[PDB]
Design a protein around this ligand. Structure first.
Ligand SMILES: COc1cc(Nc2ncc(F)c(Nc3ccc4c(n3)N(COP(=O)(O)O)C(=O)C(C)(C)O4)n2)cc(OC)c1OC
Length: 127
């Protein structure tokens, strides 16, 4: 049993730029979620080998995690905020698909998502 390669966090062929929205996503949104007490299961790719979840990457074919998102932001991998927002949504959705509703990990994800949505409502206008 093996893990897939993690999602890419840089690509020399993918155009990049900075925007105040992407800055906010790193400095406020990611930062808030990253330091939250429920962040830890989401701070790196799911290690299915270690967790003995041999079915994880059979069920989840679009993995995503905040470690990857953090590196993507730091590496200026994204062109726009919606790409980053999509990654957070993929991360939450994977949890809700793989785990049973009501499991603690689902409650942790829901708490993080609630907080995420609050911060996204406060996204600044593009400069
Ligand atoms: C409920 O299923 C999920 C569980 C998690 N849990 C989850 N997410 C992230 C973790 F870091 C983590 N730590 C963890 C959890 C269980 C563990 C171990 N570590 N280690 C320690 O590894 P290290 O030696 O310290 O490196 C082990 O050695 C064994 C004994 C194999 O059991 N668990 C995380 C999930 O999604 C993000 C899950 O949904 C897929």
């Amino acid at each position: 049993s093996m893990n897939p390669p993690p999602p890419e966090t840089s690509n020399p062929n993918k155009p990049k730029r900075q925007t105040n929205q992407l800055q906010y996503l790193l400095r406020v949104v990611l930062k808030t979620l990253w330091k939250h007490q429920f962040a830890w299961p989401f701070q790196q790719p799911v290690d299915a080998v270690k967790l003995n979840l041999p079915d994880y990457y059979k069920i989840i074919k679009t993995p995503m995690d905040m470690g990857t998102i953090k590196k993507r932001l730091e590496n200026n991998y994204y062109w726009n905020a919606q790409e980053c927002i999509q990654d957070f949504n993929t991360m939450f959705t994977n949890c809700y698909i793989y785990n049973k509703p009501g499991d603690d990990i689902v409650l942790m994800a829901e708490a993080l998502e609630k907080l995420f949505l609050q911060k996204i409502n406060e996204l600044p206008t593009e400069e």
